[PDB]
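User
New here, help please:
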Amino acid sequence: NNNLQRDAIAAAIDVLNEERVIAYPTEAVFGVGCDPDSETAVMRLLELKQRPVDKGLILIAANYEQLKPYIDDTMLTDVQRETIFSRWPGPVTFVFPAPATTPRWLTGRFDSLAVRVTDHPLVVALCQAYGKPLVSTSANLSGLPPCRTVDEVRAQFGAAFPVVPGETGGRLNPSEIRDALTGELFRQG
């Protein structure tokens, strides 16, 4: 309990100052994340990745406080809250038409940003702590093995702090990125 709280806080402040990427819980396969609105994210991606920069990974939020000014308020409405709140917190990512006013280095590809909201794991504590989302990236590098579990990054770096220990049942990939513009299913028959 207390240790977990410290772990979340440690990751938030550490990355804030250290400016990098740390282990992030995933609703499917272990991944890593960082602090939104930061030069390190764009640079660290373009660094070893150099390609997905335009696509722009998926970001995880814990509070709607950041979904309210990050998307037009026309999409969002009392029924939307109820519906998203009454229909799972967010098991799938949706791409909303980000505002033109905002920069373009966040996607630079097209006017649509894929984001997801989750409220149940240690993610909140980490996001809530920072008071803002956590960018979500896949657990991989240029050629360095991934992080099957926190036991990995640990044997790998000795974290045991800048990490969010845990586990998951085991699923293929039910979480995807749908066009929030229509929200239509994949099947057409």
Remarks:
- The first strand starts at residue 22 and ends at 24.
